[PDB]
Enzyme design. Sequence first.
Site, PDB file in Angstrom:
ATOM      1  N   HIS A 102       0.873  -1.170   0.000  1.00  0.00           N
ATOM      2  CA  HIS A 102       0.000   0.000   0.000  1.00  0.00           C
ATOM      3  C   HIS A 102       0.916   1.226   0.000  1.00  0.00           C
ATOM      4  CE1 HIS A 102      -3.367   2.688   1.213  1.00  0.00           C
ATOM      5  NE2 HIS A 102      -2.370   3.356   1.764  1.00  0.00           N
ATOM      6  N   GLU A 103       1.911   1.211   0.887  1.00  0.00           N
ATOM      7  CA  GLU A 103       2.866   2.313   0.994  1.00  0.00           C
ATOM      8  C   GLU A 103       3.727   2.421  -0.268  1.00  0.00           C
ATOM      9  OE1 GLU A 103       2.688   4.453   3.553  1.00  0.00           O
ATOM     10  OE2 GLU A 103       1.102   3.163   4.341  1.00  0.00           O
ATOM     11  N   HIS A 143       2.273   4.485  -2.884  1.00  0.00           N
ATOM     12  CA  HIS A 143       2.460   5.915  -2.676  1.00  0.00           C
ATOM     13  C   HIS A 143       3.831   6.280  -3.207  1.00  0.00           C
ATOM     14  CE1 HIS A 143      -1.099   6.745  -0.448  1.00  0.00           C
ATOM     15  NE2 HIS A 143      -0.810   5.883   0.511  1.00  0.00           N
ATOM     16  N   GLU A 198      -4.843   9.382  -2.210  1.00  0.00           N
ATOM     17  CA  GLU A 198      -4.986   8.423  -1.115  1.00  0.00           C
ATOM     18  C   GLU A 198      -6.090   7.425  -1.452  1.00  0.00           C
ATOM     19  OE1 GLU A 198      -4.948  10.086   2.972  1.00  0.00           O
ATOM     20  OE2 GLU A 198      -4.833  12.085   2.064  1.00  0.00           O
ATOM     21  N   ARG A 257      -9.520  -4.181   4.709  1.00  0.00           N
ATOM     22  CA  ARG A 257     -10.740  -3.457   5.060  1.00  0.00           C
ATOM     23  C   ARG A 257     -11.516  -3.127   3.795  1.00  0.00           C
ATOM     24  NH1 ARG A 257      -8.914   1.983   6.272  1.00  0.00           N
ATOM     25  NH2 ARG A 257      -9.422   1.778   8.504  1.00  0.00           N
ATOM     26  N   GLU A 266     -76.739 -34.859  11.941  1.00  0.00           N
ATOM     27  CA  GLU A 266     -75.652 -34.124  11.300  1.00  0.00           C
ATOM     28  C   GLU A 266     -75.891 -32.615  11.384  1.00  0.00           C
ATOM     29  OE1 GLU A 266     -73.005 -35.739  10.187  1.00  0.00           O
ATOM     30  OE2 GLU A 266     -72.041 -33.809   9.766  1.00  0.00           O
TER      31      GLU A 266
HETATM   32 ZN   LIG Z   1      -2.329   5.954   2.255  1.00  0.00          ZN
END
Ligand SMILES: [Zn+2]
Length: 1287
Positions: free
Chosen positions: A229-230, A233, A267, A369, A1185
Site C-alpha cells: 500500500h505504501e 504511494h 490516497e 478493510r 348431522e
Molecule cells: Zn495511504
Amino acid sequence: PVTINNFNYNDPIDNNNIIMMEPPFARGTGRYYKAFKITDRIWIIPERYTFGYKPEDFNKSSGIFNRDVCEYYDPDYLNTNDKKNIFLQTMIKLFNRIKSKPLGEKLLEMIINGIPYLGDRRVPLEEFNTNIASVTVNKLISNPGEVERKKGIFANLIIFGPGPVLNENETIDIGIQNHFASREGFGGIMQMKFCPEYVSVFNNVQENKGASIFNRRGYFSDPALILMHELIHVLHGLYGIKVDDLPIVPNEKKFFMQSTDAIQAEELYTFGGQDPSIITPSTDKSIYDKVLQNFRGIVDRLNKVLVCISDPNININIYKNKFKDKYKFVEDSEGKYSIDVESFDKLYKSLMFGFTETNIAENYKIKTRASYFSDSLPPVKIKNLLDNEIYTIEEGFNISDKDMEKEYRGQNKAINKQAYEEISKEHLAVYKIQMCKSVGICIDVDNEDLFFIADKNSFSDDLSKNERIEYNTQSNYIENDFPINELILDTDLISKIELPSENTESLTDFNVDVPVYEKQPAIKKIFTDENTIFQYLYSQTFPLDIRDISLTSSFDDALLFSNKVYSFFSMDYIKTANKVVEAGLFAGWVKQIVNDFVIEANKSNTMDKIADISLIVPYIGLALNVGNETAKGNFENAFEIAGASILLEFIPELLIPVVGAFLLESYIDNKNKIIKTIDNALTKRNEKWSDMYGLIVAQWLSTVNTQFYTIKEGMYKALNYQAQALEEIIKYRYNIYSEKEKSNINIDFNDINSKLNEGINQAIDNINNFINGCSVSYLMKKMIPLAVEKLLDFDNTLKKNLLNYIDENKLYLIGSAEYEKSKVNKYLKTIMPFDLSIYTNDTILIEMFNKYNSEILNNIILNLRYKDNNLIDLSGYGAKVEVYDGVELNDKNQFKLTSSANSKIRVTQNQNIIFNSVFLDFSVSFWIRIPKYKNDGIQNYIHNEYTIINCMKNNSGWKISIRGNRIIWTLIDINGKTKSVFFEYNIREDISEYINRWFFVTITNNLNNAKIYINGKLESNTDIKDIREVIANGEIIFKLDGDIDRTQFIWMKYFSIFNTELSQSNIEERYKIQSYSEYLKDFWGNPLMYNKEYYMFNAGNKNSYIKLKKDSPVGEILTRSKYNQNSKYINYRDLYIGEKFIIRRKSNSQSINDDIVRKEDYIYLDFFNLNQEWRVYTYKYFKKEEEKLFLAPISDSDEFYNTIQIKEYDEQPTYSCQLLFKKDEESTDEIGLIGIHRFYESGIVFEEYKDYFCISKWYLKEVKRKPYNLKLGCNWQFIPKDEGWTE
Ligand SMILES: [Zn+2]
Ligand SMILES: [Zn+2]
C-alpha cells in the site's frame, strides 16, 4: 526480474550495498545511519524515524498524533542490534513475498526503474542538476569516526523503522522551497516509516468473523499488503504524479461529526475499491490534467536538456533514454520526444487504478478493510513473521497446509490465535470526544466512532463552468478502473532500459523542508444535552466492577444507575430477564430468556407490506435514537412517513451546480464543422449528465452511506451490549447458588452464548439489508432527482441554444438545418438512466443497487396514504398533495369524492422522475367503491360519462373515467391521439360482486398494451402501439367532472402509481396484501362492526334471506324480492330484506355502543323481532348431522349454546365469514357452523322442500378443503343500509 539482497545487520560496511547514509532530513549534519540495499535504488535503515519528532513523543502520553488511529507506542522497538537484524530479515521476507507474484514484482520493478528526474522546478529546462536533496543522498565513505570523505548516490526509496506510533506507516516525499518534485512530474527520493509486526485490525461490517461475537471477531492485516500500500504511494511520488487537488474534508460543525485530516484523491486511488468513487469525475479529470501537464514539462525538458552542471560524469544520453522509457514518451527517428496520448493513458491508469491496495489484496488472496472509510480497531502484534509455520512468502498467514487459505482464516483473529497478541491498552492512545451535559455526566466516544460526513467543500463545482464547443471538441471520461489481468501480462510496461549507475557527486546543497510533528490532546471536551446514538449505546453498558445488574426500558434510569442497563427489547423480555428463580427452575428459565432474546432480535425480519415496505427493523429507534428522535413514538410509523431520512444524524446540503452554458463555435460556409459542433455538443451534454451523476454518487458515499455505516456498526454494538448484559445476569444468578446446587443445574454456558451470538448474526444480516436499502433509497429518491432537475434545466437551455445556433446557420447548413433541427430534439428527449455500476465496480455497492432495483415496491412513484386527517405521498418522491374541503377522509384510508366543487385532490408530481421511459411504462392501482345507480335515474347513469381522476399536460396524458357501470382508462399522446380500455360490470345480476362494493383496480401500460385488472384478474386489453408520447407527469386532479347527478359520489383507497408495468403476479399479490385485515368485513367490504344493524346474505344461496317463521322459533329461508320497475337496463334482488341482525360482543361488558369485530371473536348473534332483541341459539343435544337454529328472546338456558365464534377459514380475499358454535371458549369441541339446510315437509295438504337457518357439522370438514369453497352455505355476509345502495 527483481533481486532481493541478503545481509545481517552486523555485516561490514562496504560503501556500496551497505553504507553509512546521511538521510535527506538530516540536512547534511548529525549522525549517519547504517543502510542496507535491499534492491537497486531501495534502502532499508532499521531504525526509528525520528525526523520531525520529539524524543519524549516516543512514549505513550495523554496526546496523540492522528485523531483517527488507535496509536501504539513502544520506544524500545528496534533498540538493540538483534532487533535491527530481525527488522532487516523481516523486510527481506516481505519483499520476497511481494515479488512472489507477477503483480508485486512489477510494482517493485516500476519503483526500481522510476528514478527521480535529475532536477526539479527550479532547474533550467536545459540542465540536469543532481545537487538537490530530492535526487542525491550522501554516504560516508571515510573510515569509522570521521566525516572526511563522503560520496553521493541516487536513490528511489529509503525505508525506516516506525516513528513514535508503530502502527502509523507513512510514505514521505521531499519538499524544497515549499514545492514537491514528486508532485510536479519529476519524482524524488521517497521515504517511508514502516513496522511489520504491529499491524492494523479490521472487520467486515456486512458480515461476521467466523460467526463469533463473544470472540475476537475481526481480521488482522498481512504486513506485505500494508507495505505494498505504501509502495504504491512511493510509486506515485517517484513518477511525480502524487499531486494535490480538491480534497475530501470532513464536516466538523456538529459534535457527532468525525474529525480527520483532509483526504487527497491520491490516497483514495491508492486504496482503490469504492474509494475512487468518492472522487468525482470532475476532480478525476482535474488530477489527470495536472499530471498530463507535468509530463509535458518533463518531455519538453528532455528535448532541451544539454548538460548536467552538477556531475561531469553524468551521461546525458543514458538518462534521456531512461526518462523516455520511464514516462513512456515516444521518439521520432530524429530524436525528438513527444507525449503519446495512448501510452500516457495506459501508464496513468496503471499507476492510479491498476496498482491499488484492493487489486493487490484480491490478487494475493489477502483480506483487507472494505474501505478507507471504515472503523479502525486496536492494532495487534504478529508474534513471528519469520516463522514459516505462521507466515510464508508464498501465502502469508493464509497457509493451505494449515487449512487457512479458505475464507482468509489465517488472518481471522478468532481462528489464528497463535499468530498474534493483543496489545497493552496502557500503551494505546486514542483521540476521544468527551460528551458532557450542561450540569454532570460525561461520556467518552472515540473519534473513530463518530459520523464521517464530508463537507460540501469536498466536491468540485466545475460543472458550473461554461464549455466551448467545436468541430473537434471531444468527450472526457476517466475510468477509475484498469484491467489487472492486462497489467500483469503487459509486455512493454516494465523498463527494458538500463538503470544508470547510482554513484555521483556528493550533495552539497542540503536545502530541504523537514516536517515538524507534535501531539495534540487525546481528549476533546464538548457540551451537549443531546441523547443520540452515543448516549443510547452508553446507557446499554455497565462498569467492570459491578456484577449485579438489571435491565430496564427506561433510558434515563439506565444512565442514572450503574447497576441499571438499558434494553430496547420488549417489556416482557425485560421482566423475564430480571426474574429470580429457584435452582430447580434456573435451567428452564435460562432456556426461556435465551429463547426470548432470539425471538426479540429476530424481529429485525419484520414485514410491513400493507405500507409497501418489505423490511423494517422496528427496534432501531429504541436501540440508538439516532437521527430525528427515532426512540420517541412508534418507529415503524415514523419510517412509513419519512423513510430513510429519519435515521440520518445529519441531512447534507448537496452540491448540485447549474451546468455551465455551452458556447458553440460557428463556421460560416462550413457545413461539416457546424454539424460536428452540434453532434459534439450533444455528446458533451451526455458527459455532463454522467458527471453530475458521478458528483452525486461521490456525495452519497461520503456524506450519507457513511452515516448508514455508523448505524450498522451501532446496531452491531447494541445487540452485543444486550447479549453481554443477559450473559452477565445469567452468570450472576447462577453463581448465587451453592456448589451442591450448581452441580445439579443442567446449563451449558457455551451453548447459551452460542444461541445468543447466532440470534445476533441473524439480526445483523437483517439490519444490514434494511440499512443498505435505506441508503440506496436516499440516493434514488433524495439525491438523484435533485440532480435530474438541474440537468433537465440545463437540457432545455441547451435545446434553445442548439435550435438558435442551427437557425443562425440556416444558410450555411443548406438543406439540412431541419434534419438536425430534430436530431437536436430526439437527443435532448431521452434522459440518461442512472446506473451506479458506471461510477463504481465495488461488488457490495452494485449488489446493493441491483437488489433495490429488483424490488417492485421501489417502482412506486406516488403512494397516497392517510396521515393525521390528511392524504400525503409516502412514495418518498415528495409529491405535493392538496386535499380540499369537499373530500371526506377516514383512518381506514378511504376517501370520498362528491359532486361538490371543493371535493377534489390536487397532486403535483415530482417532475424529476424517469417516468417518461420513452416507451410508456407505468401502472396505476387503487380500490374503489362505486354506488348503485338511482332507479329513477338509470338513463343518466348509463349515458353520462364523468372523469374522476385526470392527469393532463399539454393536452397529453391519461384519465380514469366512469360512465354508469363502466370504468374507463384513457391515454392521449402529444398529437391528440386517444386510446381507451375499460371494465364494465353487469347491472342485471340478482346479486352483483361490484355494485357499491369495494374492489381492486390495476391499470398497466407498456409499449404494446393498456391492461385493466380487477381483483387481480385481467379483464380487458387494448392495443396502444399507435399511441405516441404520452405526458404523464402533469398534475393529478381527483374530482368528479362531467354531467353528474348531485347525489353522485365515489369512494377510493390506496391510490398508487408505479413507473413500470406490474405483472399479474405483482397485482394478485398487491390485491392480497391490501385485502388483509385482523377483522371481518361487511357485504360492502367495510370493517364488520359490533352493535350495527345488518341484513344477512348467504354466499351459497345468493337469492335467499332469513325470516323468523310466524309460528315457530326458527328462521325459514325465503327468496329475495326483485327489482319491480320495467327498465331494460337493470335488475337486482333486494338486499334490505329479512330480519335485521346485530352482532354483540361476548367479552368485556364495556357497554354496547359500537366497535370492530375481529376474527376469532366470541359474539352473540342477535336480531330484532319488533321492539325486542332476540338471539340465535343451537339446541345443545342434537344427534343428527344438523339441526334448525333456535330463535328466541335473550335468555341463558342450560339447554342451548348461545355463544358464537366468528371465523374466517378462507385464506384468500373475501367478504364472507363463518360462524362457529363451540361447547365453550376453551374446549376444542366444535358443535358446527351456521348455514342453510333443505328439509322435506309433507302435510295433509302441502308437500314441499323448505330451507331453514341451520347449524351443521358437515361444514366442519368442508371449510378445510382447498381451494376454499366460496359457494358453501356456511359462508355469510352482513349488509348494513348504505347510501350507496338504494332499492
Ligand atoms: Zn495511504
Ligand atoms: Zn472514516
